[PDB]
Amino acid sequence: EDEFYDALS
Amino acid sequence: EDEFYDALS
Amino acid sequence: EDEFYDALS
Amino acid sequence: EDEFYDALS
Amino acid sequence: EDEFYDALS
Amino acid sequence: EDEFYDALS
Amino acid sequence: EQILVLDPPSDLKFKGPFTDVVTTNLKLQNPSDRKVCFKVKTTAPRRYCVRPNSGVIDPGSIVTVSVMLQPFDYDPNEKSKHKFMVQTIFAPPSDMEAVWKEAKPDELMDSKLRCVFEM
Amino acid sequence: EQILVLDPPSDLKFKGPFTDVVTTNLKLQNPSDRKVCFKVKTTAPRRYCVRPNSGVIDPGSIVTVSVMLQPFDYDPNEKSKHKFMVQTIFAPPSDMEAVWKEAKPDELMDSKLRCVFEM
Amino acid sequence: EQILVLDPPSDLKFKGPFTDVVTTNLKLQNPSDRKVCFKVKTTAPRRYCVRPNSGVIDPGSIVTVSVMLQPFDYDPNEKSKHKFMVQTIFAPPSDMEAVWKEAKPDELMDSKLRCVFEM
Amino acid sequence: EQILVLDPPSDLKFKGPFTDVVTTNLKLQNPSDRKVCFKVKTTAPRRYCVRPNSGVIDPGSIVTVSVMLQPFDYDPNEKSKHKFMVQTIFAPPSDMEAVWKEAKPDELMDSKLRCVFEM
Amino acid sequence: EQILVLDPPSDLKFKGPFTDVVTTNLKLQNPSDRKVCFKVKTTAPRRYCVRPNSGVIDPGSIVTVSVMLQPFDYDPNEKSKHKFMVQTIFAPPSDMEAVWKEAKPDELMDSKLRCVFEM
Amino acid sequence: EQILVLDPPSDLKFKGPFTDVVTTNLKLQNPSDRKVCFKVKTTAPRRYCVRPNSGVIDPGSIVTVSVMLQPFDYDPNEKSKHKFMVQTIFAPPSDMEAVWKEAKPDELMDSKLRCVFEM
């Protein structure tokens, strides 16, 4: 279910 | 008086 | 390239 | 201000 | 006996 | 000739 | 299995009010004898700043990641569905882009954390 | 004079307990029509992590700097002597090292902030 | 060009093991007829203590700077990327902060050294 | 009784050859709930550089002092008579001169260390 | 108040050239009915030899201390910031170390002299 | 033969006026691989203070002795008959009395210096 994206800094 | 150094991350 | 920081004592 | 040190001989 | 002096830096 | 004595400090 | 030790291991708690940025810390400890690379991911990328969002942790060392929840209208009745993922790989011997693209899926380790909003 | 607008403009407050890392945020707004480069310095560099500790702020934009006070045995009787400096210069047209070393003293702008520990 | 003479001129060597602090010395000789101010910088500030990390060298005189490598898990296969910079300026006629901020980039002299780890 | 904990507690060892400066480290740990001031003294002040030669140690903290034995013609048959003293006092609430002159002899704590030369 | 009478009472003059050791004399007269102990301190300990650097002056007596300025590159335009301090106490009834450490700060008397270089 | 090298080797010069104490320096250099003990003697012990009047010089080291001619009514027509002697012996492995009395006369080395008064 969960779509993980690169975190922004 | 106060000696400032580069902050570390 | 190289980022130089004040050395700590 | 002035830091005094034992004089040497 | 031992005479202690301020250390130099 | 010369009489030498311990020097005083 | 994840090589790094995470404190907190599984839930990231954020304390309100949320009219300003609220930060929580994620400690990443490398107990191993090898460098470890990491990257942070989230299900809610617009809602957070993460600093650093990636890096490398020397054998024996610890890095604390700052997780900055952006301000918002808080519904004490909505419970957060946000999650984070810390992905890791043992460090290879220049460039971190090249590092992540060369990584075999068998090499990759993940930890997931659930976010929790308290008042 | 400093081109950037700082919120807070002059005192950085940190709320205890200090048995864990305590973060405070520093908003750097560039109201001007030019890019602005910045670097953060401190009188107590072992005592803090600052993320980012440098960068570039586009005309019209805002960057929030995270100031992370490291844990320590808090003496509610000792008032902090720590200060920060945000040094700035208008952005020139590759390298940020080369940018700082080329900067004439007349070009440089500083803001100073005093740290304040509350419980 | 750099006015001071550095022994060693370009590589600083650190001898293991590295389970304890390892010091190497940097000799700064002022052969000239003027006082010279110095500041030491590093690409890896958390990894070293440098004592003194700045100061003034009288004409004719010599100061030996102690570079203290902090303990770590040593990978004999990783070669060091660390560097140091000794930045100098001829001494002007109260305060060293004021001295560095007033320095024109044309006045400044640097030496760079590469760190080397041996066993 | 000395409040600081010293590693090494009583003997400072220096490993030759001595054709160059040889450094040994003295760890000063403050286990107590109060700041502690320290000053280093020696029976042989021309033979050593000590950095720092004084300072203050926060409750809970640790400072490592670098003891730099100056080069000399080593007689493996002469055993060293040199000693060091680390004098300490609990920190009072501006100036460190004023601090030591105001100190009552009942307040002062000493540790002595014997120097030892090995090859 | 200082019990000893010092000639000169407040400025120690040194006459060049300074390519060799330059000595100036400090007379310490004890006009009082009691022995007086003395120790000399300086803000610039590497720059001077002082002989004797401590001692005891019998009631009614006088001792002349030799202050030896070490050779250096003289800047007629730099004025000397160096100072000396002569610290004194009335003599207690073996060991001089034990004498200074036992001294209450109320017992201690100082005189300060400023150094002056003339040509 | 004398092992120490003396600067000056043979005449000590004192420059007037002599209404105050006048000092000249005698440099004693030990070029050898052994410690060297020294004692200074004079034909005119009431006329001079000598500091140090005895001591030990480490191999390779240098000690500068201060020779303090006491004030007097100077006859520019009387030429000085005063002499000094520096007596030396190689250092044996506690007490410096015991050292001089144990000394065989074949072990003892002397240098003599003639004093010279100039205006």
Amino acid at I84: F
Cβ contacts (< 8 Å) between H50 and chain B: which residues?
7-9
Rg (CA), chain H: 15
Structurally, at CATH architecture level, domain G1-119 sits in: Sandwich (2.60)
- Residues, chain J: 119
Whether the bond between I17 and the residue before it is cis, its omega within 30 degrees of 0, is yes
- Give the whole-angstrom CA distance, residue E2 versus residue J43: 6
Note whether K64 and K24 are within 8 A (CB): no
Calpha distance G100→I4 (Å, rounded): 44
The answer to whether the Cβ–Cβ distance between D6 and K48 falls below 8 Å is no
Chain I hits for C4, CB-CB cut-off 8 Å, are 41-43, 83, 85
Cβ <8 Å between K105 and J108: no
Cis bond before residue I45 (omega within 30° of 0): no
Shortest CA distance to J10 belongs to which of J87, J89, J118, J115? Answer: J115
The token pair that represents H83 in the structure block? 């200060």
Coil vs helix vs strand at G97: helix
Alpha helices in J1-119 (DSSP H): 96-102
Contact between I41 and C6 (Cβ < 8 Å)? yes
Preceding amide of I8 cis, omega within 30: yes
Q: Do chains C and K touch (3 or more CB pairs under 8 A)?
A: no
Q: To one decimal place, what's the resolution in Å?
A: 1.9
Q: What is the DSSP string of K24-82?
A: EEEEEE--SSS-EEEEEEES-GGGEEEESSEEEE-TT-EEEEEEEEPP----TTSPP--
Nearest residue to K77 via CA among I97, D1, I35, I38: I35
Nearest C-alpha neighbor of G61 from the set G107, G27, G111, G26? G27
Domain ranges of chain H: 1-119
Q: Is H116 helix (H, G, I), strand (E, B) or coil?
A: strand
Residues near J58 by Cβ (< 8 Å), separated by ≥ 6?
H72, H73, J30, J35
The technique by which this structure was obtained is X-ray
Q: Which amino acid is at H70?
A: Q
Q: Which chain K residues are closer than 8 Å to J105 by Cβ?
A: 101-104
Between CA J72 and CA J19 the distance in angstroms is 6
Residue of K nearest to E3 (CA): K97
Distance CA I34, CA I90 (A): 7
